[PDB]
Structure formats: C-alpha cells, structure tokens
C-alpha cells in the first residue's frame, strides 16, 4: 500500500487463492510495463508461495493453467476447523 511485488509471499496458512489475489492486485498496482510484470509473475509467483504449495506446484510440473494450480493447492491452509462444526 504501496507494496513492492518483490515482497508478496504466501502466508503459512494463507489459502493459495488468497495469495494469488494479493499477488495480482499488487502487480496490477505496480507502475511497470507489461513485459516487466510478466517477468515478475514468471519469477515470483510460484517461488514466493508457501512450502506446501511449492511442493504441490513442483509435482504438477510446468505449463499448468492457474485453475489447475489453484485446484491442486485448495486443501492447503485456510480455516483450521475440519470436523463437523454443524
């Protein structure tokens, strides 16, 4: 606020979808060319994800869609309550 895209790192319990949103919003706010923003995405998006999501994304291999990446990482982090609350 302003935040550098270099500093966006996924929290240990932050859902990967929340991290993708924060990464996108921070990169959108950066005053930079599209070429520089694309290099930042290629260099930082997976690299700054948390260890559990990096493990999953490494196993997916290159060329996944963002939908495939978010579906693969959906179970990491987020709410800690897993049992029948209801």
């Amino acid at each position: 606020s302003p935040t550098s895209i270099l500093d966006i790192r996924q929290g240990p319990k932050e859902p990967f979808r929340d991290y993708v949103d924060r990464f996108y919003k921070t990169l959108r706010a950066e005053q930079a060319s599209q070429e520089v923003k694309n290099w930042m995405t290629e260099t930082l998006l997976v690299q700054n994800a948390n260890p559990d999501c990096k493990t999953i994304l490494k196993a997916l291999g290159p060329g996944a869609t963002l939908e495939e990446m978010m579906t693969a990482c959906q179970g990491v982090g987020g709410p800690g309550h897993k049992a029948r609350v209801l």
């Epitope: 550098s4 270099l6 500093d7 790192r9 290099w39 930042m40 260099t43 930082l44 690299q47 700054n48």
Partner: nanobody
Framework: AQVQLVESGGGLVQAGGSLRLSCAAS????????MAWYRQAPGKARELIAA????????VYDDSVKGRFTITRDDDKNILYLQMNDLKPEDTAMYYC??????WGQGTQVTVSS
C-alpha cells in the same frame, strides 16, 4: 524487514553523461534471488525499471531504459548495480533498490541537466 539497503552513486550530470549506482545490502552474507531498481520522480508513483534474478542471471527492463541502463549483481560483495549510460533530463529522479523482504534504503538522486 531485516536486510538493510543503501544506495550511492547519484549526482548531477549533463545530458549524454553516465553514472553507476550501487546498492549495498547489509544484515546477511546473501541477497534475495530477485532484486530491482525503482525510479521515483516528484508527483509520480515509484516505477519498476530493472530487475535481475540470481541463478540464471535473467534481467528485465522498462522500455524507457533499454539499451542505456544495465542491472548487475555482485553476490561476492552484496552489491546491486545500475549502470546508467546516455542520460537524459527525463531520467531525473530518486533511484531506489529493493530485495524481497528487505527494508527500503534512502535512495540516491540523479539529476540530468540540458
């Protein structure tokens, strides 16, 4: 944000001149994989003009500095550099470096006359 940065190398030059900016990282024997240079002129947002990643040494530049500026990193000294050639009055700004998770430095002023 633990690693501390500090820029040097700015000054007043005539159009067509050259400067070499240095950014010294302290607080670690190492620097983050990605580092960048930002340009900030009065009344404007900071602009991400050059970046580098360790390992493959890939770099990227804003179109306004292509063919004139070069970003390099020396991990044996913990210094990031910006070689600025063929300076233009529109390059006048405060220049700041950044590393992932680092604190911000005080920047260095570059003033280009004509």
């Amino acid at each position: 944000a633990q690693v501390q940065l500090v820029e040097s190398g700015g000054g007043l030059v005539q159009a067509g001149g050259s400067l070499r900016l240095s950014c010294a990282a302290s607080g670690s024997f190492f620097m983050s994989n990605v580092m960048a240079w930002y340009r900030q002129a009065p009344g404007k947002a900071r602009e991400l003009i050059a970046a580098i990643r360790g390992g493959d040494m890939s770099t990227v530049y804003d179109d306004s500095v292509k063919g004139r500026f070069t970003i390099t990193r020396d991990d044996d000294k913990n210094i990031l550099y910006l070689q600025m050639n063929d300076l233009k009055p529109e390059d006048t700004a405060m220049y700041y470096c950044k590393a992932s998770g680092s604190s911000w430095g005080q920047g260095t002023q570059v003033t280009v006359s004509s």
